[PDB]
């Protein structure tokens, strides 16, 4: 069981930015070299949301001071990879600074910041595509209500 954060940043230059929202994806060092948001396994006694924050720090080098958790969104994924059952819980979190320093560990070899459509294509897997699309939809609905 793993928990993570769908990390995004806002791109607020109106004529320029094709995508007002970009998602952070990390590419695995091993295996297929899958692309996912930052995530990590739970620890005994650890709250699921604290695991997601901790795993984001460990996998992407993003500290709690550099993020804001967006309340109201949570998505649990259940899938089979290499004939093993997998469960992952994601929350949404916005980075404070567009230029936040991404520091990878040995578990990942690259990162991309991508618009929703390109993030979906890289993520590839259908549950992860759904979760990113649903996260994007939630962010737009929230903006509308505050607007
Ligand atoms: Mg805790």
From Swiss-Prot:
Divalent metal ions. GO terms for biological process: AMP biosynthetic process; apoptotic process; ATP biosynthetic process; cellular response to oxidative stress; nucleobase-containing compound metabolic process. Gene3D superfamilies: Nucleoside Triphosphate Pyrophosphohydrolase. Residues 1-136 form the Nudix hydrolase domain. It catalyses: P(1),P(4)-bis(5'-guanosyl) tetraphosphate + H2O = GMP + GTP + 2 H(+); a 5'-end CoA-ribonucleoside in mRNA + H2O = a 5'-end phospho-adenosine-phospho-ribonucleoside in mRNA + (R)-4'-phosphopantetheine + 2 H(+); a 5'-end FAD-phospho-ribonucleoside in mRNA + H2O = a 5'-end phospho-adenosine-phospho-ribonucleoside in mRNA + FMN + 2 H(+). It comes from the Eukaryota. It is an enzyme of class 3 (hydrolase). Its cofactor is a divalent metal cation. The keyword Acetylation applies. Keywords: Acetylation, Disease variant, GTP-binding, Hydrolase, Intellectual disability, Neuropathy, Nucleotide-binding. Catalyzes the asymmetric hydrolysis of diadenosine 5',5'''-P1,P4-tetraphosphate (Ap4A) to yield AMP and ATP. Exhibits decapping activity towards FAD-capped RNAs and dpCoA-capped RNAs in vitro. This is Bis(5'-nucleosyl)-tetraphosphatase [asymmetrical]. It comes from Homo sapiens. The gene is NUDT2.
């Amino acid at each position: 069981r793993a928990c993570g954060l769908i990390i995004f940043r806002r791109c607020l230059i109106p004529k320029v930015d094709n995508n007002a929202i970009e998602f952070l994806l990390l590419q695995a060092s091993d295996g297929i070299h899958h692309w996912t948001p930052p995530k990590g396994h739970v620890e005994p006694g650890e709250d699921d949301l604290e695991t997601a924050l901790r795993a984001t720090q460990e996998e992407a080098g993003i500290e709690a001071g550099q993020l804001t958790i967006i309340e109201g969104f949570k998505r649990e994924l259940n899938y089979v990879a290499r004939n093993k059952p997998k469960t992952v819980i994601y929350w949404l979190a916005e980075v404070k600074d567009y230029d936040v320093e991404i520091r990878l560990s040995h578990e990942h070899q690259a990162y991309r910041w991508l618009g929703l459509e390109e993030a979906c294509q890289l993520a590839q897997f259908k549950e992860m595509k759904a979760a990113l699309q649903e996260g994007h939809q939630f962010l737009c609905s929230i903006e509308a209500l505050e607007h």
